[model samples]
Structures are given as C-alpha cells and as structure tokens.
Target chain A: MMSASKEEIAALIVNYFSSIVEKKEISEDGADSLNVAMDCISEAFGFEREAVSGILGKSEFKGQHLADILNSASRVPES
Target chain B: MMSASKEEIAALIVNYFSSIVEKKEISEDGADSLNVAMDCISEAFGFEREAVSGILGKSEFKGQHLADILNSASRVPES
Candidate 1:
C-alpha cells in the first residue's frame, strides 16, 4: 500500500478546493470567504471543527449553502 | 514579514512533531495515538482538537501528562 505523503495530502486538499471553485460550487471572491470554506472542510475531516466553525460562522461569507458544498467537495477524485 | 508558504507550514508541523517524538514527550507506538495528538494540536490552532483528542485520549497514550507536552511542543523553534 502506498502511504500518502504530506505533499500528497496537501495536494489533495488544494485539488478538492480548486475543483469546487472550478465547478462554481463556491464563489471565488474574498479571502475571508475562501479561508472559512477551507477551515470548514478541514474541520469536517476531523480537524478542529468548533474553532473553524466559530470563525467561519461569524465571517461575512457565512452562508447556509456552504455546508452542502463542503460536504460534497470532500469526496472528489484526486487528479 | 515572510508569508509562510504551505510547504513552510508543513515543514513546521513535521518539525514540531519530530521534536516531540525525539524528546520522548510522546511514545512512538500505535500510529493512532500520534494521529490523535497531531489532530488535537492542529485543532487547538483551529484544526480539530476534539476529534484528535477523542482518538488519542481513548488510545493507550491517553495520559493527562501529554496535554502539557503537546502545548509545549507547539512553540518549539524550527531548525
């Protein structure tokens, strides 16, 4: 079994987000919004959900629709 | 101020963990324990402390002493 390197993991994360943006699943405006989305997705995958959620929820880009986008983005194929 | 690239951040993380392991702060056993600690610290910094704590605290290395070790390890200078 090929163990994933940190670079690989980071790449997977970047790719997942890039795909979401490319597909128009997330709006590509405002660094805060992007940061929140990144934090939310990272949290969903067993990172710090509460801290990330607290930051994201209070940010200007806090949107109910983002939850669905984040959930769906988690499982995208790594290419 | 030099903005840290992802690679720089990742290196910091690896260095932090490596220092802890080297200092005998965390026992090098079951990958699960290490994973949990990593998650917890990452969470504390806005990553996923609960998930990490849940996993690590439930595993064999679930010692109260680790909290201090982890906290201390976070601020070590990178080589």
Candidate 2:
C-alpha cells in the first residue's frame, strides 16, 4: 500500500468510476449520485490508509513507526 | 502529459483537504463538507490539466496536438 504514482491514483478513481460518469443514462443527482459520492470517499480513504501501510513495511526497525512523517505533517504551517 | 508521480498527486489532494478533514470544525455531512468534495475534484482537474500543459511544453510536439496520448488512452481495453 505504498504511495502509487499520480497516474495510478488518477486511474484508480477515474477508471473505477468511469462508467458512472461517462454513461449518460444515470442522472447526476439522486440516490445513484449519493452512491457515487460515498464510493468516491470510501475509495479515497482506503487508498490513503493503504499508502500508510508502506511506513510499516519500510521499517528496518521492529514493530511499526511513521513518527517522522507524522511529526513532519503535524508541524506543517496551516495557512 | 507525462504523469507526475503518485506521491505528488496524493500530496495535492491530501494536503489540500487536511484542514477540512481535521478541522472537526466542519461537519462531515453538509454543504461545507460538500465543498470539500468539489474542491477535491476541482484541484484534481487543475493538476491534471497542468500536467498536460507539460506535454505541450515537451514538444517534440507542435501545434499543440496530444494525439499520441489520446490514442494510447483510447487503445486501453475497457475492463
């Protein structure tokens, strides 16, 4: 679940949902739309969590730690 | 356009939305939240389109044709 490339990420979301978007038969806003929205969110969350798994796999150390990344993230200046 | 790496793409979306996701200040199910979804889509679009711009700059291209890429993409078998 390491970070894939942007193309990979784009392909993940777009290809997975292409039919729903490209097909004209489905109306844009309804139960079907809600499903699309929810699926998009769920997919995003799953992909992100997967990316973090790499941190564990990359460990030369025991157990798991992403402290460096997490620390750097928290230190970001919110602007 | 040549694809940027996955990490670049993830940073584009995740960092953009972290405020909304972490704010707890915003409700997960509402208009403000809805804006997060839209902004994500928009940012993704803008980034991708910018990526394509690099293709133009990378000529070996003239008159701004993206035919090679367009062809390769269409050639992908729908699966």
Candidate 3:
C-alpha cells in the first residue's frame, strides 16, 4: 500500500491544472480559468511553490502530466 | 469555453475520490488511503455533502467519473 502524502496529492492537482493551461485549444476560458483553479487549489491545499517544486524534482516521472498518467492507466487491461 | 465553478471543480475532485474508494483491487492502501484523500480534498475545497449533491444532481453527466472523462479525452488524436 503506497500512501500518498498531502504534498503529493496537492502536487498532482497543481500538475493537472498546469497542463490544462498549456493546451490553448482546449479551453475558451483560457488561462484565466485554469489559473484561478490553480490558485484555489493552492490555497486549499497549502501549496507553496518551493515545496511542490522540491517534491516534483525528486521524482523520476517529474515531467509526466496527469493526463499522461491517466492515459497509461486506462490502457491497462482490467482483470 | 465552458467555465466551471469552484463548486464544480471541488465536486469533480470529490467524485474522483469517491470513485477510487469503490475499486477493490486498485490500491493496497485501500479505502483508508482514498478516504483520507477525500477528507483533505473536502476540507480544502469547503465541500458540503448537500451542496455537492445538489450540484451533481443538476448535472446531466452527474455520474461520470473523472477517469472516464480522462479516458475519453485521451482517445482524441492530438494535432
């Protein structure tokens, strides 16, 4: 059982919104909506930039986006 | 551009954890880990069961899981 720390959870969320913001065609709401989403998530989860950066920096899958992770998981055949 | 409310975002997150908790084999961490994740998410996002319930009830795709949404999105070929 691998337990995720609060930091890890927050980072995952932040990563999600960050990725969304980068995809220009996805939202007419644009960066504003995604940025606000990040702000709220940060405030809710007590995210500090340096803290999340350090956590991400330590991971081998550092650059992997949540979409990619979810994509990979979906491809696995469920038994 | 479909703009999502904060409540919508929170509900999406809560929905994600709620779905995860139901899966028996996915986590050795089990329901406990997933429950804690939900707790933190609720506290951070000011989730009220009644409020979330109302929001979800009004949504046509109320029962759709984030994993399902992510999976569908991934199927779209990137240009």
Candidate 4:
C-alpha cells in the first residue's frame, strides 16, 4: 500500500468534477479517451488511473454515469 | 506512496499464475468478469484492480494479452 489514502484518492476524483463539461469533449475517442483520462488521474494520485477508478467506482453515489465520473476524474487537480 | 513497493505489487500479479485455466471460465461474462477480477485484485492489494491494470498495461513486456494478465492477477495470494 502507498502512503496515499483512499479518501485522498476519492477527493481527487471529486475535485475534478468542476471540469465535467469540457472534459466530455475528448471522451468521444475511445482509446484516446482512455489514455487521456488515465494521464490526468495518474497525475493527481502519483498513481495510475487503473489504480483507483474501480474502488472509487464501487462507491454508492449515483447521480451520473461512471464514464462521466471517469471523465471528470481525468481533470483532477495536480495536488 | 504506501509502504507497498511497485515491485511488491508486481509480484502479486506474477504469483497468481497457477490457476490460469479456471479463471478463463469466469471471464466469458463481461460485467461478471470485471467484478470477479476486481474482487480478486482489490483483495490482493487492499487496493482496487482498476488502479493497477492501466499502469501495468502500459508495461512494455507483452508476451500475453492484458485481460489474461488481469485474470491471473485476480488470484494473487492473499498474503
């Protein structure tokens, strides 16, 4: 386990929600979307996107679809 | 980062190698495949499978396909 907390990682996903609109633009391309989203997520966590999206994904919160959740997560701030 | 090393995480993946055959059976169903795989991996890492697979996928070593790579990992030793 890394020093990063699940709460910390969760916050990273939530923080990115501010960009939900613009980020949707890039997601039209599948592999590209995957790559871009992964890049942003890894940047925020210092961990890869593959690392968190699932556990965070298992969350009960449901107002939007996961792809959109993933899209917003792609913009998480680099903190 | 957590105390777990990338190499340690990497080893968890490599160790789950014994039952490659049975795992293939569970994989035919897509959503079930994702859930079962995630359950196995998250149990192994105390982390989610979504988190590691992407970075691991970015790996250059490619003798086998990634879905199989993931399936093998889902069975990593609980230790």
Which candidate wins on TM-score? Answer: 3
- lDDT values, one for every candidate: 0.35, 0.34, 0.50, 0.34
TM-score of chain A of 1: 0.36
Ranking by DockQ: 3, 2, 1, 4
lDDT tens digits by residue: candidate 2, B12-71: 333333433455543455334435444444343334424534533332222311212221
Evaluate candidate 2 by giving its C-alpha RMSD to the native, one decimal.
Answer: 18.2
Query: Which residue pairs in candidate 4 collide?
Result: A1-B2, A2-B1, A2-B2, A3-B1, A3-B2, A50-B50, A50-B51, A51-B51, A52-B51
- Provide the lDDT at B69 for model 2: 20
Error of 2 at A66 (Å): 28
Which tens-of-lDDT digit does each residue in A1-79 have in candidate 4?
A: 2222433333333233223323653223332433443343344234554445554444332233322322222111233
TM-score of each: 0.25, 0.21, 0.45, 0.21
Write the residue-wise lDDT of candidate 1 on A12-53 in tens digits: 333434444556654344223435545533433344433434
Q: Residue B16 in candidate 3 has what lDDT?
A: 59
Candidate 2 chain B worst ten-residue window by lDDT = B66-75
Off by more than 4 A, model 4 = A1-79, B1-34, B57-59, B62-79
Clashing pairs in 1: A47-B47, A47-B48, A48-B47, A48-B48, B43-B48, B43-B49
Interface root mean square deviation per prediction: 18.7, 17.1, 11.1, 16.9
Here the TM-score of candidate 1's chain B is: 0.37
